[PDB]
């Protein structure tokens, strides 16, 4: 994916994030192929081909975490993704969260 192409799908993911419910992740990424394809224009991709695209997007950015300088200049667009991802991490969280308070 180019990076415009990953702003476009981690915009959806954010923007339909409170649709993700615990134990249905089938859904939720089937749903984001599917309109990430329909209307920005994505590649058709598989459930787990497009599961795949938001797990790299978000293991390369908790490498950027890792990597940050204090006084580092950013551009625009990492900046927005960026904040895209700390918004779905808060979200993935949150149900962690959730699931751990009542774990058997």
Request: hydrophobic share 35%; with cysteine; aromatic share 6%.
């Amino acid at each position: 994916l180019s990076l415009e192409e990953k702003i476009k799908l981690m915009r959806l993911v954010v923007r339909h994030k409170h649709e993700l419910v615990d134990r249905k992740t089938s859904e939720f990424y089937a749903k984001i192929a599917r309109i990430g394809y329909e209307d920005e224009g994505l590649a058709i991709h598989t459930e787990s081909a497009c599961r795949n695209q938001i797990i790299s997007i978000m293991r390369v950015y908790e490498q950027r975490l890792a990597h940050r300088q204090p006084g580092m200049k950013t551009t625009p667009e990492e900046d927005e993704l960026d904040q895209l991802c700390d918004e779905w991490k808060a979200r993935l969280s949150e149900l962690q969260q959730y699931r751990e308070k009542f774990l058997v």
